[PDB]
Symmetry: C2
Subunit: 931 residues, 2 copies
């Protein structure tokens, strides 16, 4: 604990220039609003006594006579002149409050404050505008406001004599403390920690200062003090920790750095009466360390206390180094906790002068400022936030969660209740009601197997068109008969419930016959791309255990299938089989198919979940037998699952396009025209290609499109309008959901595209699906908070991964709060106020000098190698060895390397640049570096 | 003509540090070989007298005792010590010259020279290595070498006493001349001109110093002097101008800047005896200004004289500014002319000491150094060039052209012969013999019309396959009969020789029938893409005057053809026409087709030129009836022209692919396999796609390919090897030529791909074509010189552009040297030593300060606006107004802006940066700039 040099006052230069404090300098350049404003009301004001009070305050306090020169230094005017006090008479004007509410200052001009008095009928408004660069918050309340009350009572009152000038204190910090023994030790503390500091809270952002606030009465203030002492904490530490709990409810990452200023006057004798700027912003690293609320708050407080023990370094300097390393944006710390607790008591309080009526601090570079201030026996808790910094509702939701959390702290005995809770739910009342409303989706799904629904439809409308595929029109009865031929044959050859049968085909009617025949037989189909490379088809079939494959005779010869495999050709090997109806032998929760995705995993899906999809789509989009769907997607993709089971369940027509290995929009646009397609289903880019093709044509070939469902990628913002142009009355519908949620698991009908959107909303869940946005502990997040989409359903999820229960256990989890089975999509998004989801992400001279510095550092620290990008103090340096570093470099270079240069450039590359840029050492140093 | 300050010698500091000259500084940093070397032979050498001579030289001349300190300053050692002279005894070793030839120095060590003496049987070799930083060339010959001869005769000889030190001269230039009155005027001269200076000669580059040299005897030296005086020139000016003529024969641009050093000693009394570095590289702008050789040389000399009148600025400084503006690469001036003419006579010459046996200057940063030196009544002309800086043969070719040009100057009276020539051909004897051999391509083309060749082939092999097109095999007789049906019908409907008939079809046999029917009728066909947008088809037909169109019935309805047009469908509207042979009524030089290219131009091509192409390809690639060509290219592209006329002229088979609007390599690879295609023709990328498709397959579906001709884009370097892998024995052949040279006009058979190539060679011309590489005056260039390809032929060119004789006259020009008609391709390339062609190209604080400087400059100069990028002196400034500029900026900024700062930063943005970076003015200046 290295003691600090003493302060020697220098009154002969009291009027001489002196530098801005580090925090005053930041406001000087950072304004180029920046002011505080206060308004009190009283029945009467004696203006003569009020002017005498301010004339005495200005005379007594040099800080009220300090002005900034154009060159960024400041000095104390000796006799600035009469105090400006603007009086405005409104005692005659009716609706005077509206006339005064409709009337809403520079450091280079005196004064840096603004005094106004408004006379009204029966009352007076006193108004004080003050530049934030004039003094810090503690000088405002403990010095200015207290003396203003004392002097308005008696402008001749005795005031404690000024035993030093703030100009002395400011020079003492810059010349004697900064760079001295303790500063160097404290600087090493911060530099060891710097590259580990997390960013500022990353809170949800929107598309000038507002106020959330609350006042704790004296008896809850006393209870809050007991709750904090019970954990060994100050009230500030308790409130800072509670604030970090709440911010973690909305922040993208649980680790963040808060700006927690202290107002250290260093016990300099007399300094408690000197108006100045004592702000030292401490950069508090808030990583969650603890299982319970109490443990985390206690751990955070211990870090705050350690940081505070090293506060001879001013946080503005730590922020400067952070910006050198990361750039100015990533170094900004715009979330501040400003506590005025723990300061000396002031003689008088401004509440004895008038009842506060309006007040607002507009601070540059600050988005959220949590202010903690004692006011007349009560604890005032204020959140000042900048409008438009945060998504609508975020700050009000966080405040309501903060009051809830502090209230529980007052309600619960230490060691019980919220103190022991793993976490506090931060969702608002409205968050939960909207999410519950949107996710109240359970519906019973009748235990009818997928093929049984199709066969019943084939009995209903046996002569309607089922599959139209390239100059061939299969009727419902014809398709059912061939499915029966396949099913009887497969049953006879030993397929039993649970067996997988491969379907290796190209687009054509044989895919539809094969699927329904496999299901009729009792098995599940395993579709595999007939254009797979190498012997992928054989690897998937071997891995899946599928001993039978159905294919097309025109295709059998270009497939490498292992020799023990039964390979039947859908279109020739079944012509003599029975067409006798086959009777179902699997159950609704048995697999209907296995679809492989990116080792490749086999996604096993049951009949019940597909029936759910099909029933939801039919009702939601009014699918009828008149509809004609274009089956674009390949059988081995999830998206084809609706194409296979939806239209055929209700009597509509599947239009199968010719096989294609690259997009052919013109073929598809012709096919949409000629077969009068009503139902498009594809990834967004294929719809774009189709719409482009139509735009370049004179017929309107997409005019029969009434429904277009696109999913699996970002939807261009102009695509829906472009599609509706080529097809009036078309409903464009966004969808989504991985293979594990069974094709489509949510929808967003795109009825109109707000041009303020960055993307189309991802949508709301279909029947029997629930879309949670969860944090890393699988707990649901408030509105706007980014998290992973977890899709919960007891029937609309895949059964799991084929033969892989360990990966099934990792992705199909039990949500902790409800015990629901949920699938972790790996996609990220956030909940929207209307219940929808926004998807966010789908699943060399100096160089030689630097090597020299690095090698010299490596030997000094005892390390093999040391990178030129390393921070000297993080690599293992400290105060005394950083001094040895300056000497070893002086020796080896033959040039002067001051100690200030090593400490001012902890990053080894930055030290090289500082040495090479030094006129007194540069050329010499570069010569030695060149060997 | 502002006089210069006087030189005041300062002998009290003769041993004190002093700076390197600007040219010495460049060598100091620019070495980090750099030396000169000399070797003379004499029968005897008296080593005692030789050592005494060098000990006297070293004592007498401070420059021989000057060393560079590690900090880049230099000083004069007082007593450096005995002169090192290494003696090597080889009088016993046999083959001693080989032992001495196998034995081939730092400024910080003394001496900066290297003295050796080699004793051999009967003779001695004296060897002198000298650092280029020690002294300039004029000090070497006029001071060192002359005094070495004087002193070896008598080491006690009287020498002119040193009346000053080179250290005085070097300080006088840096402190008194530089920055003074005349320097500022000269600096304004250069700065006005700087941004206009062309780059260094851009000469052809290759994939450590060599010597071309010649010695003019005294009587030709005297004649050369008379030739120069006859034009008012010095011999140096004559030789510099002749050198610029020759360099223009190879350089990519006719304008270049040469580095022409002068060795000015400024008539300082005594300085003619002082060894030092007097080099001032003058940057000579060599733009051709004149109709004849004489006029251009006279104009260039007048610029050299003007430049020389402003040589108080050292060219190293002009080069520094040029590099600030353009970067270091584009500012380098590595082509130097070093003349030692016009200097005082030296008392003795090194030729009196020994016969020179070997000498070489290795200069950093120099690629070609033309040295002009008087030697014992003769004129020595030396080209020192760096090996590998230039393409092989370029420097030897330029030297031979230079000797030829100077020889003509000695042969011709002024006012006659070469003096009056518009230009001198610079091609070497070998250049012309190779080009003539390669371009001796004339062959008579028999007057047989294109359709007559096909009809004769249809009589020869009437049952062979002509066109195989998508499940349809047209025989030669079947194709001839349908061509006759079309031709008789078109003849009957009024087609006469000269008429154009549109062909608007998609790939299919109807294109082949339509072409031969139109030709049989007597007209020319005009193919137009059936997939053209909008009403392009109607615009082209209207523009071309084509009143008839043939199309396909399956296609007629999607075409917008104007109403007065006859539209006949090849496949239905001709079934009842006569198949009687029709007799030809056009001639071989009448149009066969019109093909439109990028307003669009109609390229009109006659029968004769197509017969030339077809006959050349048949012989060159041995096309026989067994061959089967894949007609990939569209009829409306040039590349299809061979497909239409080549195979059918000799009995081979055209395999037509299905129409395609995007590449389908797999279809094409199938089609190559199934129809046994032997002849591929396409742009390179389509062959790449086809080869990729085959690589991914197990059959070798391209195995029947024996010939692949690719043209129209860069050929990837690995494509030929990749194609030969998929098809052993395949000949890959590169081709090229625009539509105006009738499909293919040159070939390069790619038999093996040198991995040192950056591209495949473009090739050599086919029969009746000649490929010239011409400069901007349409004159042929030497080997390696970049120029425009001009394709000359009286029959292998298009007749011209349809209805557009003015554009025909601009692109189909008469070459000036031969009167040949040639087509200017707009492509660029260069001739290769083997006769081929390589194609080269196919057809904000400072910001505010800167605005402040600019506005102040704009008012001072009287201009409305002035850009921040402008050079103050080019915008209109000069010496006196640049001084006024420093004062106006001092006034308006309130900060000191020294005059040196305005002159050291002529570019207004650079002045802003210098002011903003000045500690004594920066912060103030930035404040004012911010308004």
């Amino acid at each position: 604990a290295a003691e600090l040099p003493p302060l020697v006052p220098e009154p002969g230069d009291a009027g001489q220039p002196f530098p801005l404090t580090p925090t005053q300098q930041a406001l000087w350049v950072g304004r180029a609003g920046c002011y505080g404003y206060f308004e009190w009301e009283r029945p009467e004001l004696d203006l003569a006594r009020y002017r005498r009070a301010w004339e005495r305050l200005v005379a007594h306090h040099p800080g009220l006579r300090t002005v900034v020169r154009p060159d960024g230094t400041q000095h104390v005017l000796e006799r600035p002149g009469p105090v400006p006090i603007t009086v405005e008479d409104l005692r005659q004007d009716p609706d005077a409050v509206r006339r005064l509410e409709e009337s809403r200052l520079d450091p280079g001009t005196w004064p840096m404050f603004d005094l106004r008095v408004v006379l009204l009928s029966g009352r007076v408004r006193v108004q004080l505008g003050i530049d934030l660069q004039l003094m810090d918050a503690s000088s405002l309340f403990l010095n200015l406001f207290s003396d203003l009350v004392t002097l308005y009572d008696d402008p001749d009152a005795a005031l404690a004599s000024q035993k030093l000038a703030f100009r002395d204190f400011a020079r003492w910090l810059e010349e004697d403390v900064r760079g001295g023994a303790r500063w160097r030790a404290d600087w090493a503390y911060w530099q060891e920690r710097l590259d580990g500091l997390p960013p500022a809270p990353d809170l949800p952002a929107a598309r000038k200062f507002e106020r959330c606030m609350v006042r704790c009465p004296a008896e809850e203030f006393a209870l809050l003090r007991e709750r904090a002492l019970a954990h060994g904490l100050t009230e500030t530490e308790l409130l800072v920790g509670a604030f970090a709990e709440v911010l973690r409810g909305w922040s993208s990452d649980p680790a963040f750095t808060l700006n927690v200023p202290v107002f250290q006057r260093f016990d300099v004798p007399g300094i408690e009466d000197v108006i100045g700027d004592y702000t030292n912003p401490i950069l508090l690293e808030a990583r969650p360390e603890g299982r319970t609320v109490a443990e985390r708050i206690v751990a955070l407080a211990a870090r705050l206390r350690a940081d505070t023990r090293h506060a001879s370094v001013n946080g503005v300097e730590v922020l400067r180094e952070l910006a050198r390393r990361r750039g100015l944006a990533a170094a900004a710390m715009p979330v501040v906790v400003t506590s005025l607790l723990g300061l000396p008591s002031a003689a008088r309080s401004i509440t004895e002068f008038g009842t506060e009526v309006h007040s607002i601090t507009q601070t540059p570079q600050v988005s959220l400022d949590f202010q903690i201030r004692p006011e007349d026996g009560e604890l005032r808790l204020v959140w000042d936030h900048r409008s438009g910094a945060f998504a609508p509702g975020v700050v009000e939701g966080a405040f309501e969660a903060f009051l809830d959390l502090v209230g529980r702290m007052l309600a619960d005995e230490p060691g019980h209740g919220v103190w022991e809770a793993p976490f506090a739910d931060m969702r608002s009342r409205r968050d939960r009601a909207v999410w519950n409303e949107t996710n109240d989706t359970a519906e019973p799904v009748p235990a009818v197997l997928l093929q049984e629904r199709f066969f019943a439809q084939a009995r209903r409308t046996p002569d309607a068109e089922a599959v139209v595929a390239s100059g061939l029109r299969l009727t419902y009865d014809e398709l059912a008969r061939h499915a029966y031929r396949i099913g009887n044959t497969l049953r006879e050859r030993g397929v039993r419930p649970g067996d997988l049968v491969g379907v290796v085909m190209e687009k054509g009617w044989e895919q539809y016959a094969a699927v329904y025949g496999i299901l009729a037989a009792g098995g599940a189909y395993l579709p595999i791309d007939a254009a797979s490379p190498r012997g992928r088809v054989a690897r998937l079939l071997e891995s899946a255990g599928a001993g039978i494959v159905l294919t097309q005779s025109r295709l059998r010869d270009e497939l490498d299938l292992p020799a023990g495999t039964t390979v039947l050709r859908a279109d020739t090997d079944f012509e003599t089989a029975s067409t006798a109806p086959l009777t179902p032998v699997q159950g609704p929760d048995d697999p209907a198919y296995v679809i492989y995705t990116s080792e490749p995993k086999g996604v096993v899906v049951a009949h019940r979940g597909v029936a759910n999809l099909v029933r939801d789509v039919r009702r939601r989009f009014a699918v009828t037998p008149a509809d004609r769907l274009l089956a674009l997607s390949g059988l081995h993709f999830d998206a084809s699952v609706y194409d296979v089971f939806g239209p055929l369940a209700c009597g509509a027509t599947v239009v199968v396009p010719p096989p294609f290995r690259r997009a052919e929009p013109d073929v598809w646009a012709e096919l949409v025209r000629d077969e009068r397609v009503t139902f498009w289903n594809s990834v967004p880019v294929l719809l774009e290609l189709l719409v482009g093709e139509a735009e370049s044509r004179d017929d309107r070939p997409l005019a029969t499109l009434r429904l277009a469902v696109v999913s699996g990628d970002w939807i261009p913002l102009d695509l829906p309008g472009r599609a509706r142009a080529q097809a009036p009355g078309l409903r464009v519908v966004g969808s989504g959901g991985p293979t594990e949620t069974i094709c489509w698991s949510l929808f967003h009908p795109i009825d109109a595209v707000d041009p303020q959107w960055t993307s189309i909303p991802y949508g709301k869940p279909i029947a029997n699906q629930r879309y949670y946005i969860v944090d890393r502990d699988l707990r649901p997040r408030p509105t706007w908070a980014r998290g992973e989409m977890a899709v919960a359903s007891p029937l609309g999820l895949a059964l799991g991964y084929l033969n892989d229960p360990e990966r099934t256990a990792a992705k199909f989890v039990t949500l902790p709060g409800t015990g629901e089975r949920a699938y972790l999509t790996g996609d990220f998004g956030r909940l929207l106020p209307d219940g929808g989801i926004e998807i966010l992400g789908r699943e060399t001279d100096v160089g030689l000098l630097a090597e020299l510095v690095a090698a010299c550092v490596a030997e000094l620290l005892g390390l093999d190698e040391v990178p030129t990008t390393g921070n000297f103090f993080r690599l293992g340096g400290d105060a005394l060895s950083g001094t040895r570093l300056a000497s070893r470099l002086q020796d080896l270079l033959g040039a002067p390397v001051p100690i200030r240069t090593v400490f001012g450039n902890p990053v080894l590359g930055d030290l090289a640049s500082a040495i090479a840029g030094d006129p007194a050492a540069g050329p010499q140093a570069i010569r030695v570096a060149r060997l």
